[PDB]
Amino acid sequence: IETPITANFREGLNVLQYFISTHGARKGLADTALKTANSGYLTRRLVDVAQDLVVTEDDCGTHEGIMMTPVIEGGDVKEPLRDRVLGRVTAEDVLKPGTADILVPRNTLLHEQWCDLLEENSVDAVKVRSVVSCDTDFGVCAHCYGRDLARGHIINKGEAIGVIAAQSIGEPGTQLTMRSSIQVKNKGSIKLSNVKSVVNSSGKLVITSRNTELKLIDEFGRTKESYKVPYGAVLAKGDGEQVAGGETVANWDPHTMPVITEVSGFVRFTDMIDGQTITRQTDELTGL
Amino acid sequence: VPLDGGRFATSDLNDLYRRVINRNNRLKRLLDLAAPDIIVRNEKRMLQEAVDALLDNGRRGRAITGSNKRPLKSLADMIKGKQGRFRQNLLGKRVDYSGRSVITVGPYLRLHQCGLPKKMALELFKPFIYGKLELRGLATTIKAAKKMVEREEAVVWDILDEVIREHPVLLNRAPTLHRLGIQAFEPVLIEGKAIQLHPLVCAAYNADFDGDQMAVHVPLTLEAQLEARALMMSTNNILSPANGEPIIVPS
Amino acid sequence: GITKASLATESFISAASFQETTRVLTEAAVAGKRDELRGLKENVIVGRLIPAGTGYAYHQDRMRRR
Amino acid sequence: VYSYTEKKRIRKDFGKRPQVLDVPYLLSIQLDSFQKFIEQDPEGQYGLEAAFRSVFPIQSYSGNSELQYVSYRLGEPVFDVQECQIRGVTYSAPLRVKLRLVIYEREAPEGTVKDIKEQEVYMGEIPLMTDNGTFVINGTERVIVSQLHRSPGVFFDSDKGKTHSSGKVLYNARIIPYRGSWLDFEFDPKDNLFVRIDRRRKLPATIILRALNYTTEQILDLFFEKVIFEIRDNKLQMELVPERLRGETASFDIEANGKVYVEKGRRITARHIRQLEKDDVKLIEVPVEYIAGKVVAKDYIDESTGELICAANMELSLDLLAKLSQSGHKRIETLFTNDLDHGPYISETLRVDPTNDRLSALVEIYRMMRPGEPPTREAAESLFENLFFSEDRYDLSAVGRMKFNRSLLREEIEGSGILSKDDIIDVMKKLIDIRNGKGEVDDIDHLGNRRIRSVGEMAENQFRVGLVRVERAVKERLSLGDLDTLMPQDMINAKPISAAVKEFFGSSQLSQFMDQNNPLSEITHKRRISALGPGGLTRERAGFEVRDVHPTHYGRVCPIETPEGPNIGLINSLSVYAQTNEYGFLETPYRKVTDGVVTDEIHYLSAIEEGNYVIAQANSNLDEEGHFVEDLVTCRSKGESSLFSRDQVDYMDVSTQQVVSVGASLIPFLEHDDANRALMGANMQRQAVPTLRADKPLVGTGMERAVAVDSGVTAVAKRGGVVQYVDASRIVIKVNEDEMYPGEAGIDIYNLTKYTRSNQNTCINQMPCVSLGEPVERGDVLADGPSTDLGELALGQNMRVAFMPWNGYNFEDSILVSERVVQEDRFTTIHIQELACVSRDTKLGPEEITADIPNVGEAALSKLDESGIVYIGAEVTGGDILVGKVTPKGETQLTPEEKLLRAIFGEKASDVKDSSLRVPNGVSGTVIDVQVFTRDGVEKDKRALEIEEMQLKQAKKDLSEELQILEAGLFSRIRAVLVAGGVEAEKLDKLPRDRWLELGLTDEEKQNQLEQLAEQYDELKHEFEKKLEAKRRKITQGDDLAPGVLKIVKVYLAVKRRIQPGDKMAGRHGNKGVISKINPIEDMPYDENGTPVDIVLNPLGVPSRMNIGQILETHLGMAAKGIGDKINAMLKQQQEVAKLREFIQRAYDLGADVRQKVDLSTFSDEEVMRLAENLRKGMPIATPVFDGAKEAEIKELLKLGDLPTSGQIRLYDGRTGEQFERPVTVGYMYMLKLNHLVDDKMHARSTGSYSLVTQQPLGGKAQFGGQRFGEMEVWALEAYGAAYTLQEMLTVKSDDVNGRTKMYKNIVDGNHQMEPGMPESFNVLLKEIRSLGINIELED
RNA sequence: UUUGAUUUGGUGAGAGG
DNA sequence: CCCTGTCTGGCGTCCTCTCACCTATGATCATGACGGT
DNA sequence: ACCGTCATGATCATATTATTACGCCAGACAGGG
């Protein structure tokens, strides 16, 4: 509503302002009193899909597990690696970021002391054991689950993890709601992934691949920023380069899909006939 | 069973079975009498629809009804639904040795103990008090003990403080969402009629004190007392199982 | 999906305590299905020890002594 | 000037806006609707006359008989309200109807009937309404609640977005009749037009246009324009109006008059349209490709062959043009089917149609209604004339015809109740216009489309359904009997009418049990706009938008008073000034702001008349004439608030209290509370309980007197005068002579209602509040009710509160209360429980109520009399015997000698077992009232004869005192008349007083008046004779009762519940709380005067739960008590009235331009002392809702008392005796005790009874039951490793019967051990699955 | 060849958390 | 024959507390009150 | 005051019709390019 409620509660609200306030608050009470049914039915579906899964071994005997990286949406690094790899047992032994060192062994639980020795060495990402990669028939082994979470140690042989997991996902169901180009922020080094590129005539490295990931790696080794750069964008920078904080490093036009080339030469109209294939629309306000 | 009065409040299945038997008797009599084809086709069709209405009512076209327009409840409707046997009597049951009252604060408590009223304590612990009274030798038969606690003499409160002492109880707030909503305490007896609940523990139950109610349950057997002390005690739940964050945070 | 996955289980009491009981009981009846209990809600239905918590030693013992 | 009870305690009033329309009578919806229902109403409608003239005359199945209608009449009820609530009857009135039977002859139904008969007939019993606005159905006072539903008429909704998953919106046009078959026109993604009738199968829409006898040529004449092609010598020229060409790209070069107008490849601009219409171009030239797809309108036939050239609604090709060109046709009529302007929806619809004439359309409609049966032309005509076009089965109301004409832009709002052809064609025209892009759709939640039914209209509809069942019965009987020998009471029977109206008032979804524990709760349950019930939506299905406040609830439906939980916004409460329109919509007052001046005339606007005009906000500043003092003023135009100029306004609101309801206008400082906390405050103010001595609100809104007087708990004076006799039972008013009838001499007697049971087990008392010899005015309180005081409304009590954290005992929301509160007996509420005991009739004989009872001794029977019933006054405990009743013996041991009765003793030797029916415990009390009802024929025992003699004696004394008191008033009238005209000063009292008529006086008005008083006196004599005989008949007779019951004993216990840790108290802003510790007096924080504070709240609830109004209420309450303490100081020192007059005048002026303006110079030195006697416990202050007391006025009133300006006193501690740092806030808050007590929720069970079908414990508290260890608790114990706890929690403690008896033996022997077994309810699951064709087992 | 106290069902409406 | 609207079934939160309200009938032997002798 | 006639209450099988106004969301089905 274009006219706000300029009066607080210490000054008096008049009539219209309180009525607009009642719009805004009746919507919230209706949302909670109808949201709670979906939250409870979500907890029910979750504890009946889980319902069976019991910690029933001590090691499945595998070497597979998901690759825990810190998550980065495009702003500053949102959830650090110490939040994701706290108390989860590594899959293979993490190499120290210098060269080929056995920093941690390959079946160690990562409690707070190990995670601090991970944060000192600025470890990139940890290949850690996940429950979906567990090889145990009819249950989850004790290492592929992780830390007990309300006990400091590993999960005991027996403790029902499906039900506590289903409750822990569905329990915050009440608090949840129901109803141009790239500008860098920090100052570091450039790295490109999924890139197949070419240098244009002016010098800005344009990209012949749609799915290119533009990472900003710091001077330490960890990945601090990530972005998605489209097919055919004007990169102000290049691979492995050092930039300044706030300098624009990418540019494109999304309303005009570029059909840029790899080589040079002359242009011919192959199967382009005016009258059937293409049409003649001379511009009104420009003339070109 | 009859309700309070002189008539029998009959179940719906008796209507269903009584109709199937009425129709089956009619069909046997018509096959005795050699009625023509269309009569016994309607008779067997009414029996088919009667059996199909008995088993799963309303899966066929519009369900039959006795009183008044509401359809009557069949066997499959004794199984299925929110109020069948699974979701209403086998997964969740009503429970003896249990109680319920309004909560209040009582901040003098240590966080392994909760306040529990004397009237609820003498009602929930009637068999332990009976066993204690029969051990001392104050009475003889069970009747005498039930008269003693029906009168509430001066000697059963010492018996009650000697059955409480190291015996945990399960406090439970009514919308239990995660496992920290059932926690086991040790009772401390309360002159009053309200459960005194230690304040830090409230942030686990999502329990404010604006009119809330909680249920108490008594672990009867010995393995259940040990599970209440060793797994479900309130000192043992100081970290939320969803993460690593402490749940006994000062509110 | 979670409701299609909990109704497609090898234990028809687990898939009957949940949503529609008509479909699951006819599928289990005409298949002649059998429920080697082996989970939490079958043992909450049938009235015995949970095979997770304290009862996991009891179910180790019973599974060993067959 | 002020009324005499307004000179008792005149409430201080802040407030700035001078009112112009006072609060109306708050119960006008119920009373006005039911007065509209039952009243002798001529000119047909509304009322019962509408039903009796729409279902009658019943004419027979061609037997030439007819049962027509004359009139109706309701006799008096046999039972008045008090006897009806005591005994348990309906409060009904018999409905006598005068019906007439006429019987026509042969060969002339337009001929003379041979015989008529007109007579009185009995049908049904409709329950009357009491003066409070409530019904008494079976001794329990019930309220029928107004329903909010959809307005009958057309409704053009748009199924937006969701269908077909391609964004193409649909448009449907639901015609909503008031009674009959629905009708939904709609579209489909192929842009066809589909009708449907009552949500049945779908047909193309034009099939009904053929059913109204339209040929296809006429249909295309209606729904399209025409395009004319003239074959004139060159390329089949065209008549062209260029308005159709607005933006169309032509296929050639349009030239005319030898001039190129339009080029090929371009479109026709608007200026080219101007050129062609300025030059008046008519005939243009088309190519052969232009009429390649033009759709012909009507049929062309060739004159030679007699065949069809081209059918109607067909595109034209080359060969069709070649055929019609050589047949002699020069004019070609086609249609204009554009992309944006006019789609060919009718044309595609007629191309999907298989039907071709009227008969096939009627056959297809008869076939979609009743599937699979042979149609016949007579049956199809009869069905389609009885769907929409008959007075019987289809009826829009006047509301329906108004909406149907208004939403189609008609002029006359009057029409027939049935549809016609033009109506359906206008619906299809408006639907096609909405699809074309002009015009708008209609929203649902807009209150111009939500009608309000009430008690009268719903009772009329249920009575009409009863009448159509009885017209089925009368049509059955009338032409299947011998005539003339019967009368019209042998035909019509009263069973379906009484069954229908008794089922509606008895158990409906809207005839609900009155929440009666408070005058506020009565007067806000009667004003309720429920959306649920029959014809409306349901809670567990819908929805989102209907639970939201629309912009046109402003001043009709309250935005902040609604129940939170599963139905928010469906159980809306109607506002204060909101009336109901003539049709049923909502309307609200406004003030007609003519061009400069706010004129003080009120003017009621509906919900759609409000939108067109522009309404000024309620609190806009104006300078003594009406001229708006600003030049930008905040207004709202069309559902949207904005800022408008000074003199473009058309209306102003009346008073600033009109957005809110009466539940949430007793909240002081409402504009400072956030709306959630105001909602919770209004709902808990409804949930209060009446205390023992209700005090007053120190900080009210002035709305208390409307809620108290305009409800029915106080004893309002009817005619003013002088009080003659006050008593705790009765009050006698002597009526003043300038208010008094000439005859029926008249002094009124108010019989108050002493201690009796309410519905919520409170104690509805009435206390007399007037002195003796005191004048009272017409319209004035005499007896305060429950939670009233001097005619005000005192729900809870006002106590000294401090906001400080005090050692944790008020942690989340808790409240900490001194023992000074419980010592003063000030929350000690009084509850009354009714305990019934019936004497049924079983086998081996009837029961015994006598006190010769087995298995009991002296200690039980000392509290009973010699006939079983407990005394009146015996203070009992929990588990004594109230009524002794013996029969329980069952069949412990089958009688050896079959039925050996006459052998040992008289009847039997106590069967086999005996146990006098002894009751439970948990509650104390004092037996205040015992009722004994006896089914007639049964021997009355000695106590039933004692109660009969008692009530005979009471009614005898009461009617004799009626005669004596009215005779005393009559003799006082005779003395008042004989002051002049033959006065005898000494001779008047020498003779006996009954002869004051034959004294010396001529034929004047005085001897005429003495003759009229002799007529009145002899009428009172014979009336007293016949009424005492009838009252002896009513006491002496039996009562009709249940099948097979001897006598019913009802006993009223009267518990007095004080306060304890665990009760719920709350203020009036949402500050809830369980009281957590009842401290001693010494521990309370006191101040540097000495007084302890009573209640210590918690400050931390204020910044999060944003209810900042309670702190302003606290400061203004402390100001009020400061003025009260200064009055108490100036009066305790025995000071003369001059200083009291000075100080009271200074405390009543004190403000800005306000409304009160009192002066004590016209109170005359005796009222000022009594006004100060009423002000010494504090000075009451009114603070209206949105025009309240600002901060500076509270500061100036805290400066009048010698209190600190900031409101905060420094407070010492009680324990340490040393000062709290940073001085704390004290004041008075008006706090309410709620009836969620703690000795009604607390429950405990070791081992009780067990259910029958599944061997699990019972549920509830009255049934001694156990708490449900639900499913999520089972999940929470699976989530730990607790396995044995869950095994005993669902096998031993709950279900397995041998397991739990082994458990009970093992617990009382000290061996904690369980033998598990199986749940018996799992065996019930095996039997229910096994009772199907399924074979479930248990292997191994 | 004689020991026993035992059982209160659906439907719909409303409130608390 | 592979997309496709269209129709039919199947979900929709736990725990608790208070109150009221509960199918019609169509046919007949035998008991029960009323009037004549 | 006894005998006969009208009236009125027990027990007992007989077996189903004249409203609409949720919102997805899978899952199966006849239609047609």
Ligand SMILES: [Zn+2]
């Ligand atoms: Zn594993």
